[PDB]
């Protein structure tokens, strides 16, 4: 649900992420493909090799979407309705995959920003991605 503290924590993290977003989305996906080979099935139509221009491009798309979700925290249903139709109606993504990517995203941010990645920050980000996942696997209109 996210508290007041949760929101400003989310805003500060994506503040400190800035332009580095694209690299972390990419890395998160590489980690998801490597650690959970099951998720590769959904990306059968692109090159998924470690260093892939298609994965790098998609990595940036994800980062932009997360950056937009951090702006409109108080209206996550509204901000991501298009992405909700993609993943829930069209793609029919199993929810576990989101837990896999959420986790690989938290590992990345822990590897790159260990100073700012506190226990209290980590709690906020885990909650944030969980609500982003809820909206994305949901089906409304």
């Amino acid at each position: 649900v996210l508290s007041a503290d949760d929101k400003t924590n989310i805003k500060n993290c994506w503040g400190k992420i800035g332009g580095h977003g694209g690299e972390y989305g990419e890395e998160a996906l590489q980690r998801m493909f490597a650690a959970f080979p099951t998720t590769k099935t959904y990306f059968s139509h692109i090159d998924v090799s470690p260093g892939s221009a298609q994965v790098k491009a998609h990595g940036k798309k994800v980062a932009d979407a997360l950056a937009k979700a951090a702006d409109h925290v108080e209206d996550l249903p509204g901000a991501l309705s298009t992405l909700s139709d993609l993943h829930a109606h069209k793609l029919r993504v199993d929810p576990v995959n989101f837990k896999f990517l959420s986790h690989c995203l938290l590992v990345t941010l822990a590897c790159h920003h260990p100073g700012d990645f506190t226990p209290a920050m980590h709690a906020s980000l885990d909650k944030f991605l969980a609500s982003v996942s809820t909206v994305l696997t949901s089906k409304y209109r």
């Binding site: 650690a35 986790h103 690989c104 590992v107 260990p114 226990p119 209290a120 980590h122 709690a123």
Partner: protein, 145 residues
Amino acid sequence: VHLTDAEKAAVNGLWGKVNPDDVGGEALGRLLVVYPWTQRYFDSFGDLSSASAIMGNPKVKAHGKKVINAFNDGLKHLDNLKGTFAHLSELHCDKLHVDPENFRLLGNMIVIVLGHHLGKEFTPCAQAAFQKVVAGVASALAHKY
């Protein structure tokens, strides 16, 4: 529990350059912060009402040392994980009544702490190898059920 030769060399090559006691301390500490309901199971631990409190709690640090010691047994005996974690499986599921889903949560905490402590050395390949381990340890403690 796959672990090929490349996955073997990655796991113990990187495990040897972290302090395991601190890994268990912080990973447990984070589990109590991130998933607050887990605090209930550790009522023998005194105060657990804030982030600053539970990370500085000695009882927590001592227990992470216990938890990582049992984890360390797993690495030595990956061949018979179900038999190594025999007594602990009984303890958590019968005496403590801990829901199995909580095991994979603590596993994930271990994984990200390694990443926190190692940075760029905790490569995607090295995560996969450690992910195969923690999932195995989780399904060795739950497996009643």
